[PDB]
Design an enzyme around this catalytic site. Structure first.
Site, PDB file in Angstrom:
ATOM      1  N   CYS A  47      -4.597   3.565  -0.007  1.00 60.70           N
ATOM      2  CA  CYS A  47      -3.861   3.745   0.811  1.00 60.70           C
ATOM      3  C   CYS A  47      -2.760   4.201   0.537  1.00 60.70           C
ATOM      4  CB  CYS A  47      -3.239   1.555   0.772  1.00 60.70           C
ATOM      5  SG  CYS A  47      -1.817   1.259  -0.038  1.00 60.70           S
ATOM      6  N   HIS A  48      -2.342   4.264   1.845  1.00 56.76           N
ATOM      7  CA  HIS A  48      -0.956   5.412   2.534  1.00 56.76           C
ATOM      8  C   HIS A  48      -0.651   5.425   1.158  1.00 56.76           C
ATOM      9  CE1 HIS A  48      -2.258   5.089   6.776  1.00 56.76           C
ATOM     10  NE2 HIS A  48      -2.603   6.222   6.434  1.00 56.76           N
ATOM     11  N   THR A  49      -0.040   4.431   0.857  1.00 57.64           N
ATOM     12  CA  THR A  49       0.914   4.438  -0.491  1.00 57.64           C
ATOM     13  C   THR A  49       0.433   5.301  -1.567  1.00 57.64           C
ATOM     14  OG1 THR A  49       2.149   1.628   0.220  1.00 57.64           O
ATOM     15  CG2 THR A  49       2.272   3.003  -2.209  1.00 57.64           C
ATOM     16  N   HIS A  69      -3.707   0.938  -6.468  1.00 58.13           N
ATOM     17  CA  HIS A  69      -2.613   0.054  -7.734  1.00 58.13           C
ATOM     18  C   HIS A  69      -3.405  -1.529  -6.635  1.00 58.13           C
ATOM     19  CE1 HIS A  69      -1.716   1.025  -3.038  1.00 58.13           C
ATOM     20  NE2 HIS A  69      -0.747  -0.186  -3.104  1.00 58.13           N
ATOM     21  N   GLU A  70      -4.511  -1.368  -5.146  1.00 56.39           N
ATOM     22  CA  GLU A  70      -5.309  -2.705  -5.115  1.00 56.39           C
ATOM     23  C   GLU A  70      -7.073  -2.466  -5.881  1.00 56.39           C
ATOM     24  OE1 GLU A  70      -5.734  -2.291  -0.870  1.00 56.39           O
ATOM     25  OE2 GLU A  70      -3.704  -1.222  -0.490  1.00 56.39           O
ATOM     26  N   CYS A  99       7.959 -12.166 -14.295  1.00 58.18           N
ATOM     27  CA  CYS A  99       8.542 -12.758 -15.442  1.00 58.18           C
ATOM     28  C   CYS A  99       8.611 -13.473 -15.732  1.00 58.18           C
ATOM     29  CB  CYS A  99       9.881 -11.674 -15.746  1.00 58.18           C
ATOM     30  SG  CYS A  99      11.556 -12.164 -15.361  1.00 58.18           S
ATOM     31  N   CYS A 102      13.921 -14.899 -14.384  1.00 57.13           N
ATOM     32  CA  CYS A 102      15.358 -13.829 -13.971  1.00 57.13           C
ATOM     33  C   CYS A 102      15.432 -15.160 -12.708  1.00 57.13           C
ATOM     34  CB  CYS A 102      14.925 -12.555 -13.577  1.00 57.13           C
ATOM     35  SG  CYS A 102      13.834 -12.380 -12.193  1.00 57.13           S
ATOM     36  N   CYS A 105      13.222 -15.141 -10.069  1.00 54.22           N
ATOM     37  CA  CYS A 105      11.870 -15.841 -10.839  1.00 54.22           C
ATOM     38  C   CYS A 105      11.864 -17.333 -10.686  1.00 54.22           C
ATOM     39  CB  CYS A 105      10.943 -15.443 -11.982  1.00 54.22           C
ATOM     40  SG  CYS A 105      10.125 -13.760 -11.595  1.00 54.22           S
ATOM     41  N   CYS A 113      11.808  -9.361  -8.461  1.00 51.17           N
ATOM     42  CA  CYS A 113      11.768 -10.153  -9.994  1.00 51.17           C
ATOM     43  C   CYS A 113      13.074  -8.606 -10.306  1.00 51.17           C
ATOM     44  CB  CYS A 113      10.213  -9.952 -10.551  1.00 51.17           C
ATOM     45  SG  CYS A 113      10.700  -9.746 -12.348  1.00 51.17           S
ATOM     46  N   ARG A 117      10.073  -5.826 -10.447  1.00 51.38           N
ATOM     47  CA  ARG A 117      10.014  -5.132  -8.933  1.00 51.38           C
ATOM     48  C   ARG A 117       9.290  -3.734  -9.676  1.00 51.38           C
ATOM     49  NH1 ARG A 117      16.291  -5.001  -7.021  1.00 51.38           N
ATOM     50  NH2 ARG A 117      15.934  -7.779  -7.621  1.00 51.38           N
ATOM     51  N   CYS A 177      -1.746  -5.659  -1.526  1.00 51.31           N
ATOM     52  CA  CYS A 177      -0.792  -5.463  -0.769  1.00 51.31           C
ATOM     53  C   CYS A 177      -0.873  -5.085   0.829  1.00 51.31           C
ATOM     54  CB  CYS A 177      -1.520  -3.473  -1.230  1.00 51.31           C
ATOM     55  SG  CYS A 177      -0.028  -2.114   0.022  1.00 51.31           S
ATOM     56  N   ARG A 372      -9.390  -0.438   4.380  1.00 49.11           N
ATOM     57  CA  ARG A 372      -9.980   0.045   3.411  1.00 49.11           C
ATOM     58  C   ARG A 372     -11.315   0.323   3.484  1.00 49.11           C
ATOM     59  NH1 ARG A 372      -5.178  -0.880   3.365  1.00 49.11           N
ATOM     60  NH2 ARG A 372      -4.194  -1.480   1.614  1.00 49.11           N
TER      61      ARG A 372
HETATM   62  N1  LIG Z   1       7.707  -4.489   2.358  1.00 46.63           N
HETATM   63  C1  LIG Z   1       6.850  -4.255   1.423  1.00 46.63           C
HETATM   64  O1  LIG Z   1       6.259  -4.407   0.806  1.00 46.63           O
HETATM   65  C2  LIG Z   1       5.413  -3.069   1.983  1.00 46.63           C
HETATM   66  C3  LIG Z   1       5.701  -2.121   2.996  1.00 46.63           C
HETATM   67  N2  LIG Z   1       4.743  -1.282   3.796  1.00 46.63           N
HETATM   68  C4  LIG Z   1       4.814  -0.541   4.723  1.00 46.63           C
HETATM   69  O2  LIG Z   1       4.566  -1.094   5.760  1.00 46.63           O
HETATM   70  C5  LIG Z   1       4.072   0.636   6.780  1.00 46.63           C
HETATM   71  C6  LIG Z   1       2.862  -0.334   7.409  1.00 46.63           C
HETATM   72  O3  LIG Z   1       2.066  -0.097   6.574  1.00 46.63           O
HETATM   73  P1  LIG Z   1       0.127   0.040   6.936  1.00 46.63           P
HETATM   74  O4  LIG Z   1      -0.378  -0.743   7.991  1.00 46.63           O
HETATM   75  O5  LIG Z   1      -0.738   0.044   5.506  1.00 46.63           O
HETATM   76  O6  LIG Z   1       0.262   1.594   7.005  1.00 46.63           O
HETATM   77  P2  LIG Z   1      -0.595   2.373   8.040  1.00 46.63           P
HETATM   78  O7  LIG Z   1      -0.181   4.009   9.069  1.00 46.63           O
HETATM   79  O8  LIG Z   1      -2.274   2.623   8.346  1.00 46.63           O
HETATM   80  O9  LIG Z   1       0.072   1.901   9.839  1.00 46.63           O
HETATM   81  C7  LIG Z   1       1.121   1.977  11.287  1.00 46.63           C
HETATM   82  C8  LIG Z   1       0.410   2.167  12.302  1.00 46.63           C
HETATM   83  O10 LIG Z   1       1.601   2.064  12.794  1.00 46.63           O
HETATM   84  C9  LIG Z   1       1.340   3.195  14.237  1.00 46.63           C
HETATM   85  N3  LIG Z   1       2.842   3.366  14.397  1.00 46.63           N
HETATM   86  C10 LIG Z   1       3.531   4.750  14.005  1.00 46.63           C
HETATM   87  N4  LIG Z   1       4.495   4.601  14.273  1.00 46.63           N
HETATM   88  C11 LIG Z   1       4.812   3.472  15.666  1.00 46.63           C
HETATM   89  C12 LIG Z   1       5.865   3.911  16.273  1.00 46.63           C
HETATM   90  N5  LIG Z   1       6.896   4.737  16.365  1.00 46.63           N
HETATM   91  N6  LIG Z   1       5.788   2.837  17.113  1.00 46.63           N
HETATM   92  C13 LIG Z   1       4.577   2.269  16.807  1.00 46.63           C
HETATM   93  N7  LIG Z   1       3.283   2.420  16.361  1.00 46.63           N
HETATM   94  C14 LIG Z   1       4.059   3.076  15.497  1.00 46.63           C
HETATM   95  C15 LIG Z   1       0.425   3.602  12.981  1.00 46.63           C
HETATM   96  O11 LIG Z   1      -0.446   4.743  14.705  1.00 46.63           O
HETATM   97  C16 LIG Z   1      -0.350   2.971  12.926  1.00 46.63           C
HETATM   98  O12 LIG Z   1      -1.175   2.482  12.946  1.00 46.63           O
HETATM   99  C17 LIG Z   1       4.719   0.984   5.903  1.00 46.63           C
HETATM  100  O13 LIG Z   1       5.578   1.926   6.190  1.00 46.63           O
HETATM  101  C18 LIG Z   1       3.527   0.657   4.521  1.00 46.63           C
HETATM  102  O14 LIG Z   1       5.017   1.766   3.459  1.00 46.63           O
HETATM  103  C19 LIG Z   1       3.578  -1.547   2.746  1.00 46.63           C
HETATM  104  C20 LIG Z   1       3.102  -2.629   1.868  1.00 46.63           C
HETATM  105  C21 LIG Z   1       3.845  -3.298   1.294  1.00 46.63           C
HETATM  106 ZN   LIG Z   2      -1.768  -0.467  -0.908  1.00 46.47          ZN
HETATM  107 ZN   LIG Z   3      12.077 -12.069 -12.787  1.00 52.79          ZN
END
Ligand SMILES: NC(=O)C1=CN([C@@H]2O[C@H](COP(=O)(O)OP(=O)(O)OC[C@H]3O[C@@H](n4cnc5c(N)ncnc54)[C@H](O)[C@@H]3O)[C@@H](O)[C@H]2O)C=CC1
Ligand SMILES: [Zn+2]
Ligand SMILES: [Zn+2]
Ligand SMILES: NC(=O)C1=CN([C@@H]2O[C@H](COP(=O)(O)OP(=O)(O)OC[C@H]3O[C@@H](n4cnc5c(N)ncnc54)[C@H](O)[C@@H]3O)[C@@H](O)[C@H]2O)C=CC1
Ligand SMILES: [Zn+2]
Ligand SMILES: [Zn+2]
Lengths: 379, 379
Positions: A47-49, A69-70, A99, A102, A105, A113, A117, A177, A372
């Site tokens: 993925c993008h990460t 990581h997936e 863990c 904490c 958790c 965590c 984390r 993810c 994916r």
């Molecule tokens: N909070 C968390 O724990 C997690 C956060 N993330 C984040 O979530 C976000 C989404 O991840 P994915 O779905 O894998 O990414 P992705 O890049 O596959 O999807 C993003 C989508 O948003 C669209 N987009 C971008 N800017 C836009 C805007 N201003 N207005 C409207 N649409 C827009 C893109 O065209 C694309 O279709 C990423 O920033 C990722 O890093 C990912 C996983 C865990």
């Molecule tokens: Zn991922």
């Molecule tokens: Zn913990």
């Protein structure tokens, strides 16, 4: 079994330089130390990460590195003091841990965590600051404690979820993810009520997971927003009922949404990473009862900005890490929902390649429209 | 009774010019029109909201004007179609209303009535755009639909709460604003759990109400924050357990609070109106489960600003209007809590003056340390 306590010689996809193609290398994998397990990887994905830290633009350039990581895998052996996992267990290594000791958790709300984390710059193991990977005597950086682009990897047991051994490991390798993050962003954080309206910004894997959660919650209108109109037909399979491209409108998108819903949506989920979309996702929710959830990660240090009166008009702003799911306690339940036909996973799979062709997964990702790609181990 | 349907000749405190002393004038009060009631004011009070629009600095200068929006009174007569109020009822006119017909008035969470929500620039009555006050044939602007600095005033019945007729009208005349706003900010919006920690920014009437709510909620630590150390001893009467002046610390106050509480407070309530305090109140709550509530009104159009990762670390930001209390449905219950000794009101009273000396209430307010001044009608 015969490999227990031994160094394993296997293949891994090694990143030697930022932005350059991975190389399949013969590596050595050390046996697991205290609180660690060693996992045979059967399926992994991209993925993008992974791409972000492999490109290393504006990022600390840790190379050589094993990303990934997936993944879905099987425990090969366990380290000292591991009792909740044993060889043969079917497992998901996850980029963040539990863990169990904490305050987070022990909480209902938080998966933050203190020990385990997510840490994007940690290149070694928590136990000892060492790498478990070497190539010709020289160590390799880990990634997110998972490093799943290897036939075998070593992971802190707190980051390894034991799952239903009848679950197909290629479909569940993507619950680690984006799917679970968006699913929980809607179900655990946004918490729409039956019949309510939900706007989703971004229709990648995270936004599609948010759409599934909004359908499970019984939302009557699920408005999917994205600059990329190719992602619309795809999104309708995951629960999205209406699609809106901002490019097609002169008015700001938050005005467009408010006009569609007579004051704004009941809930919004921001799944883009664009700080401007976070502002828009907040301002598009109804006054009085609207709740916006931030999920996307910003690239820069632009700040979220809004007029304080938007809150005094009784809007709420939340944020989520990994859908607020605890990786060891809750993620196995997510897989159970897949096993009981309550959650769609197969439709996330847009591509597949063998491990030797892992660089093609980068191509499909960087070209767009790939949700994916299932990377199959063994050839 | 004998005044029913008649114009009343009485005294009001008229603001003729911005920032100049009020003048007690003989005015004429028209009888109430449809959905209005005419109220005999027995007690009124003054707060910074009245002072702000009387000073009219950066504000639309509506003059002449009858200010005042915190009062206890008795209904003298009712207009066409008023059925929930009758002459002799004991009432609180409130600066915002409850029409009972819109989606907000049918909601659990929102008091943002579409028809009758607060409007600081409305100078006349909702029914007809007219003033019910005249002096020598010339009309006078209303304030917040209440204009309680008059012996009699006319108010939309949706902004008039019927209360327990045994409630003392001098103590309850201050439930119409700061007390209920902070009380509900804690109890309805912040929602601390028993044993939790709460930081309160600002120890005026709003912050003191928030402290009372935090004590009712069973918070074990209630940290009161204010630039003014004179307000500390006062605050401890209302539930505050620790006091912190930011001036006494080199570190930013959100760091000071996090260090006091091992990561941050469980809840914060911002009761200053300073946008910098809103940022600080947000950033001082714990990650994972912290919830900050904005209450203060900003003077300028500075925007709330924070790094988006502060939300992704699972903080929540809320805001409140009037504690999220519905004025006709919920405020009578607040008075009931006073009547049942569950809520402290007498300790808000720091001053009292007769109506002819109303300008002294401005002096006590502008000098500071005055919480509320009971303005007694009749001399
Ligand atoms: N909070 C968390 O724990 C997690 C956060 N993330 C984040 O979530 C976000 C989404 O991840 P994915 O779905 O894998 O990414 P992705 O890049 O596959 O999807 C993003 C989508 O948003 C669209 N987009 C971008 N800017 C836009 C805007 N201003 N207005 C409207 N649409 C827009 C893109 O065209 C694309 O279709 C990423 O920033 C990722 O890093 C990912 C996983 C865990
Ligand atoms: Zn991922
Ligand atoms: Zn913990
Ligand atoms: N949201 C709503 O529905 C309502 C909002 N309000 C607002 O709530 C706020 C509080 O009102 P009151 O208690 O009547 O005001 P106040 O002026 O009596 O109290 C404010 C207190 O905060 C302190 N303070 C100011 N800036 C500070 C800072 N940066 N850090 C720490 N302490 C600071 C002052 O020293 C003072 O003690 C005002 O902005 C008012 O307009 C008032 C009533 C209704
Ligand atoms: Zn209404
Ligand atoms: Zn007031």
């Amino acid at each position: 079994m015969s490999t227990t306590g031994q160094i394993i010689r296997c293949k891994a996809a090694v990143a030697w330089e930022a932005g350059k193609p991975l190389v399949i290398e013969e590596v050595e994998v050390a046996p697991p130390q205290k609180h660690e397990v060693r996992i045979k990887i059967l399926f992994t994905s991209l993925c993008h990460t992974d791409v972000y830290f492999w490109e290393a633009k504006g990022q600390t350039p840790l190379f050589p590195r094993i990303f990934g990581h997936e993944a879905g895998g099987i425990v090969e052996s366990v380290g000292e003091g591991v009792t909740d996992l044993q060889p043969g267990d079917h497992v998901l290594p996850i980029f963040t841990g539990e863990c169990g000791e904490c305050r987070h958790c022990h909480s209902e709300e938080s998966n933050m965590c203190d020990l385990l984390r997510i840490n994007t710059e940690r290149g070694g193991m928590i136990h000892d600051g060492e790498s478990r990977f070497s190539i010709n005597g020289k160590p390799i950086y880990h990634f997110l404690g998972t490093s799943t682009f290897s036939e075998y990897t070593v992971v802190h047991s707190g980051q390894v979820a034991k799952i239903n051994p009848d679950a197909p490991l290629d479909k569940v390798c993507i619950v680690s993810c984006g799917l679970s993050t968006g699913l929980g962003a809607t179900l655990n954080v946004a918490k729409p009520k039956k019949g309510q309206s939900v706007a989703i910004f971004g229709l990648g894997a995270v936004g599609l997971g948010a759409a599934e959660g909004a359908r499970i919650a019984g939302a009557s209108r699920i408005i999917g927003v994205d600059f990329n109109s190719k992602r619309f037909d795809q999104a309708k399979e995951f629960g999205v009922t209406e699609c809106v491209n901002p490019k097609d409108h002169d008015k700001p998108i938050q005005q467009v949404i408010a006009e569609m819903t007579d004051g704004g949506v009941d809930r919004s989920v921001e799944c883009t990473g664009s700080v401007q979309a976070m502002i828009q996702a907040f301002e598009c929710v109804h006054d009085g009862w609207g709740v916006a959830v931030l999920v996307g990660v910003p690239s820069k240090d632009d700040a979220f900005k809004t007029h304080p009166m938007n809150f005094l008009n009784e809007r709420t702003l939340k944020g989520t890490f990994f859908g607020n799911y605890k990786p060891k306690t809750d993620i196995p339940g997510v897989v159970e929902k897949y096993m009981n036909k309550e959650l769609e996973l197969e439709k996330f799979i847009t591509h597949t390649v063998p491990f030797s062709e892992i660089n093609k997964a980068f191509d499909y990702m960087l070209k767009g429209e790939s949700i994916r790609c299932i990377i199959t181990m063994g050839a």
